[PDB]
Amino acid sequence: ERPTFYRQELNKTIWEVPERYQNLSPVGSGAYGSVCAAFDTKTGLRVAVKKLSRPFQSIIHAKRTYRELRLLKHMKHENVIGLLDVFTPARSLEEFNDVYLVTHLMGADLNNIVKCQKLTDDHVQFLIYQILRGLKYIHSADIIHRDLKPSNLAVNEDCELKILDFGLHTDDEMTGYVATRWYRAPEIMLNWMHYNQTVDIWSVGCIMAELLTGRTLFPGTDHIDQLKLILRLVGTPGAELLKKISSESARNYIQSLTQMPKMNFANVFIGANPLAVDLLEKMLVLDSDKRITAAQALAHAYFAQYHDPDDEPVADPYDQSFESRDLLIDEWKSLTYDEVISFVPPP
């Protein structure tokens, strides 16, 4: 039956949540809503509670809301954020208008870790191993992160990690000297072609490089500057990659550039474990068809001390046919409502 809900104003909005959640405290906007840390008295867990703002304002928001809930209801892996609870104060479809998502709360993100701790190579191994283990699971359900960066990698005090914000920025956001663009595969930064899950491996390459050196790998001041930094390191594209760039416009620009050889990674990453250098070479490949995959990378010798092939699970089939569907707001809202009401807590 239905819990009792109580009301409070947080972030100049009214938050209405079940009594089990106490000591709500704002933690800083999340994807499509604001988030509060809270104490879940029922489980004894520190949780994060996201209130979607205007979930059913438009078709875009309504589909968006359904998308996020579906994604969260499906993911059940130690290295991927999952759904602890989802609720609405509404007693019926008619009054259903607010959606709250509850997940684990981690004490830091990877951006905090990289900024204020010294990471040994063993830390680099473990952290990257977990990101690759989570991505294998995500990629197996045909989900692409597309925006993997240190700020959406949550980490507990034991250095155990979860991936957030997969499967869901404007132009201004990607503009200038900004982390929102530093980890993006070039094919997506410059819209070269229909991209796919390989975009996430480039992002991992960029994060791993940064854990090893403490410094952003390609901190471009804009898209062009960033492309120049990238090509300086990995070489300009060859004939075969070029043909695959289906944007005639992008192909044309990139061919205007002076050809440059790929650099020696052992010279760029002095002191680094040679195995780490090898994996960076396999991840940081301009041609997405030729980058190592998450499943392949887990078997790389850099991860010998963590790799366990019987303990790197794939996901249950994820039906995302809804993605190609056009529906009205009320249709997306009712679909969402069914998913709220049919939620079953993890055990």
Distance CA 190, CA 192 (A): 6
- Residues touching ligand G11, count (CB under 6 A): 22
Distance CA 208, CA 204 (A): 6
Which residue in the set 40, 85, 109, 210 belongs to the binding site for ligand G11 (CB under 6 A)? Answer: 109
Q: Which span sits near ligand G11 by CB under 6 A: 30-38, 89-97, 248-256, 302-310?
A: 30-38
Q: Is 165 a catalytic residue?
A: yes
Contact 193, 245 (CB under 8 A): yes
**In the complex, what is the shortest distance from the CB of residue 258 to ligand G11, in angstroms, rounded to a whole number?**
41
Q: Does 138 bind ligand G11 (CB under 6 A)?
A: no
**In the complex, what is the shortest distance from the CB of residue 312 to ligand G11, in angstroms, rounded to a whole number?**
20
Contact 84, 40 (CB under 8 A): yes
For residue 30, say whether it is annotated as part of any ligand binding site.
Answer: yes
- DSSP lists the bridge partners of residue 154 as 109, 162
User: What x/- string results for residues 156 through 185 when contact with ligand G11 is judged by CB under 6 A?
Assistant: --------xxxxx-----------------
Distance CA 150, CA 40 (A): 27
For residue 50, say whether it is annotated as part of any ligand binding site.
Answer: yes
Q: Does 31 bind ligand G11 (CB under 6 A)?
A: yes
Please, which residue, 56 or 66, has the CB nearer to ligand G11?
66
Which residue in the set 24, 108, 327, 340 belongs to the binding site for ligand G11 (CB under 6 A)? Answer: 108
Q: Does 72 bind ligand G11 (CB under 6 A)?
A: yes
For residue 31, the number of C-alpha atoms closer than 13 Å in the C-beta half-sphere is 16
Which residue in the set 52, 99, 105, 272 belongs to the binding site for ligand G11 (CB under 6 A)? Answer: 105
The active-site residue, picked from 165, 200, 278, 287, is 165
Q: Which of 272, 191, 184, 286 is nearest to 232 (CA)?
A: 286
Q: Does 99 bind ligand G11 (CB under 6 A)?
A: no
Q: Which span sits near ligand G11 by CB under 6 A: 5-13, 105-113, 128-136, 292-300?
A: 105-113
For residue 31, say whether it is annotated as part of any ligand binding site.
Answer: yes
Provide the annotated binding site for ATP: 27-35, 50
Residues classed as catalytic: 165
Q: Which residues bind ligand G11 (CB under 6 A)?
A: 27, 30-31, 35, 48, 50, 68, 71-72, 81, 101, 103, 105-106, 108-109, 154, 164-168
